[PDB]
Design a protein around this ligand. Sequence first.
Ligand SMILES: c1csc(C[C@H]2CCN(c3ncnc4[nH]ccc34)C2)n1
Length: 167
Amino acid sequence: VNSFSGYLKLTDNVYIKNADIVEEAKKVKPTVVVNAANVYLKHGGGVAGALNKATNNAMQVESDDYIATNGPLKVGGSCVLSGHNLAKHCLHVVGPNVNKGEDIQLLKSAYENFNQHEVLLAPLLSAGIFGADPIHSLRVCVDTVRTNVYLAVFDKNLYDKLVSSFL
Ligand SMILES: c1csc(C[C@H]2CCN(c3ncnc4[nH]ccc34)C2)n1
């Protein structure tokens, strides 16, 4: 028994809610919150810019040191950094950017990173400003992640659409 509240159960291991991931994180303080990162860990908008603002820019400061030491992530890759005031850890995961010509099959690789963590609070990936279809994306999540994932969907019309169209 964990502390997530109000989620709809989609499968044995996937749960969903119409919620802002930042508000969910502040309330639950989960072991792992997933960020929808880019390869440079430049947190400008969407999930990344909202989480980072909620950390008072501490996430960006930590991220810039990570990049200076290690170089960029791979599309489909991830790194574990601090969760600051939002979670114990933040798993920064890079989904493909279809508006950069990046292969959408890399979305499955991106979700595979979630399997290294028993429980996660996460958004939908190479959703929002990353330009992917949020049906196909939910489907890849369900068919790839085997650990327990709590999805926070910010847009109400996407959520109602995702739930009503979920096979
Ligand atoms: C509607 C318009 S763009 C879009 C797709 C993604 C971009 C923003 N995303 C979030 N997901 C969960 N919590 C969040 N909090 C802030 C942003 C956000 C999903 N949904």
